[PDB]
Amino acid sequence: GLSDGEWQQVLNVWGKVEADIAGHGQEVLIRLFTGHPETLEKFDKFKHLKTEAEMKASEDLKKHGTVVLTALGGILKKKGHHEAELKPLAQSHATKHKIPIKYLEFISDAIIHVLHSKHPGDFGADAQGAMTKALELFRNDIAAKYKELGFQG
Ligand SMILES: [C-]#N
Numbered sequence: 001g002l003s004d005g006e007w008q009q010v011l012n013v014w015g016k017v018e019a020d021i022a023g024h025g026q027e028v029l030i031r032l033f034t035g036h037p038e039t040l041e042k043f044d045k046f047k048h049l050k051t052e053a054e055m056k057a058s059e060d061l062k063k064h065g066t067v068v069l070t071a072l073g074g075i076l077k078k079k080g081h082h083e084a085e086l087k088p089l090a091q092s093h094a095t096k097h098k099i100p101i102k103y104l105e106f107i108s109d110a111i112i113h114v115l116h117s118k119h120p121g122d123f124g125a126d127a128q129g130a131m132t133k134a135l136e137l138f139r140n141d142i143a144a145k146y147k148e149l150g151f152q153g
Contacts, residue, residue: 002133007079009130014073016119021073024114025065030055031110032103039103076134082141090145094152101139101146108135 002010017024033040034052041047046064049055071089075082093099112132115123 001080001137006130006133009127010076010134013127013131014076021069022062022066025069026062027114028110029065031114032107036106042099086141087145090142094146094149100152101143104139104142
């Protein structure tokens with residue numbers, strides 16, 4: 001897990017995200033879809049988007065960006081005491097959404113990318129370290145739930 005100091009770094013970084021949650025969410029999803037087009041195919045309601053201009057222009061995508069990062073933020077604010085919030089997330093994504101576990105890695109790397117893009121010079125080594133640990137914890141606990149269910153079997 002993370003030390004108290006690391007969680008503080010994580011939640012201080014998350015304040016940057018909360019100043020524009022939609023925009024961070026949009027750019028994270030865009031980064032995921034364009035870097036990993038397979039991921040787009042799992043979203044029936046974004047499959048129609050062919051170009052990054054169309055993605056950028058989609059108001060529904062931004063809105064969904066809010067849904068996604070709200071969910072993540074509430075989990076991060078638990079500082080690892082997240083079983084109630086994380087387990088249903090895991091289960092929904094393994095069963096209903098059919099999301100391969102590796103897609104969590106992809107979005108983790110996208111979050112780091114987008115934080116640097118939007119906050120150049122203001123997302124230091126310490127802060128990236130901490131956020132990376134939190135996203136690892138996140139993936140690791142989701143993976144445990146996936147394993148229960150036999151992944152995408
Ligand atoms: C989930 N988007």
